[PDB]
Design a binder for this molecule. Structure first.
Ligand SMILES: CC(=O)N[C@@H]1[C@@H](O)[C@H](O)[C@@H](COP(=O)(O)O)O[C@@H]1O
Ligand SMILES: [Mg+2]
Length: 534
């Protein structure tokens, strides 16, 4: 590598230790913010290595703990196309975080064949967290020691940062993603939303809970750029970004999804169309209060079916339904009714994949148009190289033209790099405008099987080894046989159990034709899992 550089890395590394042991995973490095200096430093070094390995391409760093409380923070790497860090590279981060101050960077330059000829290039941003300023200061020191070029994008949503990274590495290519600034992002979405909305009108207000996080001021700033006669009026609530303690506190998409209620502080009336973003605004879900005051959730799987229905219809009327392979990508947690709706009502393939955004993104990129959402409200619609060409180059034999126009627009509206709450929100709004649907008519599209999720503490969960999109247990022996036996005893009975990646428990999900059936099925399986976890 270099000797004078290797002395600057060792010297600047001055920070803690702090003796806990780390692992970069699904969520990158994510912990209490006080444990994090040596780790963010290491990611500075790892961003440098990654940039150089990929011929001095821009690598992103996002500083965020997402839905976690204020005391928490995290750090994530973004690869050139705006994808999360390639899986094989997570271990490199791990080695660098644990490995003691004083150098070891050098050992990886040899191991990963990395060219010194290019300077590393790295963009970063952060959410509203209290530790962000100091953590960025750390990141800067690591990128000064390795003589990397870097740009501080300051405060951004997670999807904005991914946007920038994609833009920077696609400028001058055939598939230019846009202007690599915050301004660029808003401009792209506003112009796409004007096109997608041509001749159609939003009805009623949308009350968006912004989790008191970065998504609130960024949404408000996007609203300045949006066009005029769309009918869209957004009411922003929970934007107390000023107070670090307010982040994700009894509001946000994660609260609303996991607790199955509107935020306590919500002032929405009966029939007000509502949504919640998470803290870093890459998760959204809709909800409304019944004509009879019952809370009604329209989660990621519900956005997935809404999107697929709309995209299905457009591809048809655009005359390209046959040329392009369209699909919905789901996990096992997707309500069986959602799957049934996709396959029997929309006549589209559903692919079930492992839990984890990587796996859903990967499966979606196998369709020309791949809709993938998790229930928690993370997801997007993937457009393939092939999809983009045939939308841009099919000649309309009918005024079809309108539909192609609408579809081209959608490719610009829908964030391709990462699932994006603000993007998804405008998507939903555009769909319900085009379809002329209320929240009530969206909900009425099919009925969810009553379902139950349970968290089952065992010691230890590593004996729970699954396959077939995590819908079957190979280990421990006999448990799947019991689970299969149990589910049969109930009408439309479906249940599966898997180790959590993020928590120390196995999760049981169950659904059946009725509330008491689902509940009892879930409990029997939970009991069976506890016995098997002894
Ligand atoms: C960025 C990413 O890949 N996130 C995944 C998410 O896709 C998955 O739904 C969740 C499942 O959690 P679990 O293993 O505890 O059920 O874990 C992670 O947060
Ligand atoms: Mg998030």
């Amino acid at each position: 590598a270099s000797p004078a550089v290797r002395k600057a890395i060792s010297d600047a590394a001055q920070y803690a230790k702090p003796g806990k042991i780390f692992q970069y995973g699904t969520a990158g490095f994510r912990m209490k913010a006080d444990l994090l200096n040596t780790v963010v430093y290491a990611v500075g070094l790892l961003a440098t290595l990654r940039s150089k390995k990929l011929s001095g391409q821009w690598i992103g760093v996002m500083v965020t703990a997402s839905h976690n409380p204020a005391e928490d923070n995290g750090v994530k790497l973004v690869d050139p196309m705006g994808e999360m860090l390639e899986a094989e590279w997570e271990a490199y981060a791990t080695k660098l975080a644990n490995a003691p101050l004083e150098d070891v960077y050098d050992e990886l330059v040899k191991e990963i064949d990395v060219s010194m000829e290019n300077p590393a290039r790295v963009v970063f941003a952060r959410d509203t967290r209290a530790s962000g300023s100091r953590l960025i200061g750390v990141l800067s020191a690591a990128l000064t020691a390795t003589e990397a070029e870097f740009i501080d994008m300051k405060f951004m949503t997670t999807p904005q940062l991914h946007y920038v990274v994609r833009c920077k590495n696609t400028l001058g290519t055939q598939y230019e993603y846009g202007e690599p600034t915050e301004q660029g992002y808003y401009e792209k979405l506003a112009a796409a939303f004007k096109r997608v909305m041509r001749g159609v009108k939003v009805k009623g207000s949308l009350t968006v809970d912004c989790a008191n996080g970065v998504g609130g001021p960024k949404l408000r700033e996007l609203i300045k750029y949006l066009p005029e006669d769309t009918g869209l009026d957004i009411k922003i609530v929970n934007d107390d970004v000023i107070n670090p303690d307010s982040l994700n506190f009894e509001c946000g998409a994660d609260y609303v999804k996991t607790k199955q209620r509107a935020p306590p502080s919500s002032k929405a009336s009966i029939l007000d169309r509502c949504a919640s973003l998470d803290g870093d605004a890459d998760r959204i879900l809709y909800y409304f209060l019944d004509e009879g005051n019952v809370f009604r959730l329209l989660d990621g799987d519900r956005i997935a079916t809404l999107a697929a229905s709309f995209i299905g219809d457009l591809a048809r009327s655009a005359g390209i339904a046959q040329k392009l392979k369209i699909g919905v990508v789901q996990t096992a947690y997707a309500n069986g009714s959602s799957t049934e709706y996709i396959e029997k009502v929309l006549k589209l393939p559903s692919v079930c994949t492992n839990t984890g955004v990587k796996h859903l993104h990967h499966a979606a990129m196998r369709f020309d148009v791949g809709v993938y959402f998790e229930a928690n409200g993370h997801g997007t619609i993937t457009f393939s190289e092939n999809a983009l060409k045939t939308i841009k180059n099919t000649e309309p034999q009918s005024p079809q033209q309108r539909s192609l126009e609408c579809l081209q627009a959608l490719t610009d509206l829908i964030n391709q790099a990462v699932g994006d709450a603000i993007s998804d929100m405008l998507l939903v709004e555009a769909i319900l405008a085009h379809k002329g649907w209320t929240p009530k008519e969206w909900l009425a599209t099919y009925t969810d099987l009553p379902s139950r999720l349970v968290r089952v503490e065992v010691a230890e969960r590593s004996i729970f080894k699954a396959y077939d999109a995590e819908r079957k247990l190979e280990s421990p022996p006999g448990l799947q046989a019991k689970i299969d036996s149990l589910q049969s005893r109930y009408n439309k009975g479906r249940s599966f159990a898997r180790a959590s990646g993020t928590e120390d428990a196995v999760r049981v999900y169950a659904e059946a034709a009725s509330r008491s059936e689902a509940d009892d099925l879930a409990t029997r399986v939970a009991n069976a899992v506890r016995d098997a976890g002894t």
